[PDB]
Design a protein around this ligand. Structure first.
Ligand code: HEM
Length: 179
C-alpha cells in the first residue's frame, strides 16, 4: 500500500539512484567527528529514546537530512536497537527545528522524497542477543542510512515488491509534488 511523493527535480532519479546520492553526501556517522555528530532526536515523547518522530541531519556538515514518523523506539545501551514501525519516511535537506525547541519535532526545509504507508517494522527482545536484534528491517535499514549506506534499505524495499530501479517519472506508486 506504499506510495511515494517526489520533487519534480528528481524525476529522472530512481529510489536507488537518489538514496545513493543522499547517503554519500550524508556520510557515515561513525567516521564523522564528535564535533559535528548528530545522533538524531526523538519527539512526541516524554522520552529521550522514543517518539512519533525521529529526525537526523548529516554529521559531515552537509545539508542532507532524514525524518522518520510512526511508532519509534531506541533501546540504548548496550545493544542500541532501533525498533517499532515507520509509517512515513522522508528525505531532503536543511533540517530545521519546529517552534518550541526540539520538543515540537523538526522539519525539512527542502523535501525531495517521501515514502508513505511504508510499513517498516522491527521488534526488540531484551532476552535475545544484539546480532539478532539488529536483523530487524527497521534497525538494519535506518542504521545503514545513518552510516551512509543505502543498500540495506534498498533490499528491504525490494522485498516489499517496490521497484527501486525505475525512475520516479514512470514509477507507478510515485506521484510528483505540485510546485
Ligand atoms: C537521540 C537518539 C540517540 C542517541 C542520543 C544515541 C546515543 C548513542 C551513543 C552515546 C552511542 C555510543 C557512542 C558511539 O558508539 O558512537 C551510540 C551508539 C550506537 N548507536 Fe545510538 N543513539 C540514538 C539513536 C540511535 C538510532 C536511531 C540508531 C539506529 C537507527 C542507533 C544506533 C546505534 C548503534 C548501532 C551504536 C553502536 C554502539 C554499540 O552498539 O555499542 N542509535 N548511540
Amino acid at each position: 500500500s506504499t506510495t511515494i511523493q517526489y520533487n519534480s527535480n528528481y524525476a529522472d532519479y530512481s529510489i536507488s539512484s537518489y538514496l545513493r546520492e543522499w547517503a554519500n553526501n550524508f556520510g557515515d556517522i561513525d567516521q564523522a567527528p564528535a564535533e559535528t555528530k548528530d545522533r538524531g532526536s526523538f519527539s512526541g515523547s516524554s522520552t529521550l529514546f522514543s517518539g512519533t518522530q525521529y529526525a537526523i541531519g548529516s554529521s559531515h556538515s552537509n545539508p542532507e537530512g532524514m525524518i522518520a514518523e510512526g511508532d519509534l523506539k531506541a533501546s540504548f545501551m548496550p545493544q542500541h536497537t532501533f525498533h517499532g514501525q515507520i509509517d512515513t519516511l522522508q528525505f531532503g535537506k536543511d533540517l530545521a527545528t519546529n517552534a518550541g525547541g526540539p520538543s515540537a519535532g523538526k522539519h525539512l526545509e527542502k523535501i525531495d522524497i517521501t515514502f508513505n504507508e511504508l510499513d517498516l517494522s522491527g521488534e526488540f527482545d531484551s532476552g535475545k542477543s544484539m546480532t539478532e536484534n539488529h536483523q530487524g528491517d527497521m534497525h538494519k535499514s535506518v542504521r545503514g542510512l545513518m552510516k551512509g549506506n543505502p543498500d540495506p534499505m534498498l533490499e528491504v524495499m525490494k522485498a516489499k515488491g517496490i521497484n527501486v530501479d525505475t525512475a520516479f517519472k514512470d514509477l507507478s506508486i510515485a506521484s510528483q509534488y505540485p510546485d
